[PDB]
Design a protein around this ligand. Structure first.
Ligand SMILES: CC[C@H](C)c1nccs1
Length: 156
């Protein structure tokens, strides 16, 4: 079964648990490159009543560092917000709960905005068909292939 956080049939409780960053894409490529502060490796999502606890790690020359954030529900169904290097709001355009999850985020800081989309998996890698389906969604949002980074061999 596939759902959108924006849909009426979305069951947030089902995204609880372990996840992995598989692919990241952005409007502004430098934010997800090597020393980018948005190059985050998701490890777990803990679902709360009106919030989402997010646990990640960042990596610098293979050294990993823990990072946690709490995203709160906004007034729009299926949308959360979190303050991190500016103000961010995000939704989950597509997920099947037990395999993949696609996220869409908009960052705003000092009159400037950029978008970030990510593909996460319950396992550290996903099939090529799902990866290509993600590339197609990125295209719909105006993000081209040169700005999509597959991190499946850098996510552990
Ligand atoms: C679900 C993961 C989303 C896209 C986030 N990345 C940075 C802050 S929230």
């Amino acid at each position: 079964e596939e759902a959108s956080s924006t849909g009426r049939n979305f069951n947030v409780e089902k995204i609880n648990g372990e996840w992995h960053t598989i692919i990241l894409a952005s409007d502004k490529r430098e934010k997800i490159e090597d020393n980018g502060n948005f190059r985050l490796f998701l490890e777990q999502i803990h679902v709360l009543e009106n919030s989402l606890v997010l646990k990640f790690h960042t990596v610098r020359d293979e050294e990993c560092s823990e990072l946690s954030m709490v995203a709160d529900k906004t007034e729009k169904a299926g949308e959360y917000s979190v303050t991190y290097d500016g103000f961010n709001t995000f939704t989950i355009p597509k997920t099947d709960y037990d395999n993949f999850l696609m996220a869409h985020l908009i960052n705003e800081k000092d009159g400037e905005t950029f978008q970030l989309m990510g593909l996460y998996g319950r396992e550290p890698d996903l099939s090529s068909d799902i990866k290509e389906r993600f590339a197609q969604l990125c295209e719909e949002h105006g993000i081209l292939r040169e700005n999509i980074i597959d991190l499946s061999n850098a996510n552990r």
